[PDB]
Write an enzyme that holds these catalytic residues in place. Structure first.
Site, mmCIF file in Angstrom:
data_model
loop_
_atom_site.group_PDB
_atom_site.id
_atom_site.type_symbol
_atom_site.label_atom_id
_atom_site.label_comp_id
_atom_site.label_asym_id
_atom_site.label_seq_id
_atom_site.Cartn_x
_atom_site.Cartn_y
_atom_site.Cartn_z
ATOM 1 C CB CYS A 423 -0.893 -0.104 1.012
ATOM 2 S SG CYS A 423 -0.228 0.047 3.012
ATOM 3 N N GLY A 428 -0.427 -0.862 7.166
ATOM 4 C CA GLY A 428 -1.787 -0.888 7.576
ATOM 5 C C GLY A 428 -2.586 -1.741 6.707
#
Ligand SMILES: Cc1nc(N2CCC(C)(N)CC2)c(CO)nc1-c1cccc(Cl)c1Cl
Length: 489
Positions: A423, A428
């Site tokens: 990401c 996360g």
């Protein structure tokens, strides 16, 4: 981490640093109002300076500072070498004395209102030699009970912990500041009673495990009065054990290869490159199928990225972010245009076909090396675009459709390397993605009547890459993802 006080207000941390704290005394604070908002209150010049931290899902954003994977790595970065936390008037912040917390809410062994009949039942069915827990006393409102199992020559002993003027003891000897100081003391110096039995406190009693079929009833208890907040912050206070060495990413020759300077891979799981530098912000993950959690590709690391995909024989890439989100840039376009061919260093990629779905868009790319003839590799890039900027999606079905297609593609390719997930910072969203795929694959093999453990799965992954799974909303979304998977069966 005892400088983290999970259940206090802004005024108390002010009072506490002004009463029990001197200059340099700092303290961590979750802003009770907004989940995902924290504060770093530091005492300086007779006043408390509050430094705000915000976690939208990707990292801990220090206001006026840098970005960190966990709050433990944040405090360690400023305590171990000071001179980078400034009030941006020029005056510097000093972190020297951690204000310790007495709240035992987010400890593995604490259970609160848990009675004595359920506690005896829990230790008999799930406890091993050394299992233990601490609970509030029902007979004497204010005291606590420590029940330990040692082992039908297996027994469960009960040690009564009395509270006297905010100090706890076991009946005699020392009296401690908190229940933690009492537990940590007898965890190391065990309690020996009259007839020679040592009351060993090995591991706390496990209550997070779940027979995967009856998980919808656990989400009920966790949902409201917050059970999810109690379990996540309990998981968050074990991050201080995962401060492994990140020296390979902290060096000059590798600094411009990290999108975020203080989010660095562990040395024991970093993906090393060979043909040539060896450094890329990436980590191997495995509980068979493995994973590689990478960062958003920087312009100066695109060639290194495609070297890693080739070396690890990766055939599936999972992109869980857009190219531009929330103003800044989070990933560089590292793939050629459709029907186009580009050369990334010694590597070569051809985007043969793009397929647009509702939630995602898929790209069939062909990865080859310059020089060697007939280098195969069909790399499939899955680009999830329905993920919001802040928070998590409100419905797990979108990701589960996306993730089931990725798993089938991985199993279709005979002998495929790890599944590359990335990401922005790669901790996360990817952490949420990888954990969800790990939990589903267990229910995909051993069936519906297997045992899953969301908190244990996350810390197992958090040992291979810093701060996997960032927010409580991501933690809650993992539970909703698994529940929606069972209801479709
Ligand atoms: C996160 C967690 N939470 C627990 N609890 C205890 C306090 C409570 C009952 N109030 C809420 C749930 C328990 C106990 O099995 N284990 C964990 C855990 C499970 C696996 C790995 C790790 Cl590293 C942790 Cl920390």
């Amino acid at each position: 981490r005892r400088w983290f006080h999970p259940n206090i207000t802004g005024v108390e941390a002010e009072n506490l640093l002004l009463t029990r704290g001197v200059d340099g005394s700092f303290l961590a604070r979750p802003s009770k109002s907004n989940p995902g908002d924290f504060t770093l209150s530091v005492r300086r010049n007779g006043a408390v300076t509050h430094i705000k931290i915000q976690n939208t899902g990707d990292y801990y954003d220090l206001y006026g500072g840098e970005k960190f994977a966990t709050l433990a790595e944040l405090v360690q970065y400023y305590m171990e070498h000071h001179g980078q936390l400034k009030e941006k008037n020029g005056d510097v912040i000093e972190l020297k004395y951690p204000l310790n917390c007495a709240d035992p809410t987010s400890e593995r062994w604490f259970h609160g209102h848990l009675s004595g009949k359920e506690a005896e039942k829990l230790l008999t069915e799930k406890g091993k030699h050394g299992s233990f827990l601490v609970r509030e006393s029902q007979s004497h409102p204010g005291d606590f009970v420590l029940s330990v199992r040692t082992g039908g020559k297996s027994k469960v002993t009960h040690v009564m912990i009395r509270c006297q003027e905010l100090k706890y003891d076991v009946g005699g000897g020392e009296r401690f500041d908190s229940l933690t100081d009492l537990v940590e003391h007898y965890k190391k110096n065990p309690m020996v009673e009259t007839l020679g039995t040592v009351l060993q406190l090995k591991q706390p009693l496990n209550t997070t495990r779940i027979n995967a079929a009856e998980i919808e009833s656990r989400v009920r208890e966790l949902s409201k009065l917050q059970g999810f907040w109690e379990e996540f912050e309990t998981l968050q206070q074990q991050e201080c054990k995962l401060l492994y060495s990140r020296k390979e990413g902290q060096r000059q020759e590798n600094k411009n290869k990290n999108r975020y300077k203080n989010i660095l891979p562990f040395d024991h799981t970093r993906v090393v490159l060979h043909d040539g530098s060896d450094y890329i912000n990436a980590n191997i993950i495995m509980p068979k199928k493995s994973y590689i959690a990478t960062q958003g590709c920087l312009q100066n690391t695109v060639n290194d990225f495609w070297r890693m995909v080739f070396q690890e024989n990766s055939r599936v890439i999972v992109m869980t972010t857009k190219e531009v989100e929330r103003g800044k840039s989070k990933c560089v376009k590292y793939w050629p245009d459709e029907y186009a061919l580009k050369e990334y260093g010694v590597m070569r990629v051809r985007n043969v076909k793009e397929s647009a779905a509702h939630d995602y868009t898929l790209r069939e790319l062909k990865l080859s090396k310059v020089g060697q003839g007939n280098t195969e590799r069909t790399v499939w890039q899955y680009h999830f675009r329905t993920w919001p900027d802040h928070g998590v999606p409100s419905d797990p079905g979108g990701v589960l459709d996306f993730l089931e297609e990725v798993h089938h593609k991985q199993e279709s390719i005979m002998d495929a390397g790890p599944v590359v997930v990335h990401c922005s910072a790669g901790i996360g969203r990817t952490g949420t993605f990888i954990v969800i795929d790990i939990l589903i694959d267990i229910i995909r093999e051993k069936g519906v009547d297997c045992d899953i453990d969301v908190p244990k799965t996350i810390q197992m992954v958090r040992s291979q890459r810093s701060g996997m799974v960032q927010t409580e909303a991501q933690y809650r979304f993992i539970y909703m993802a698994v529940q929606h998977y069972i209801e479709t069966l």
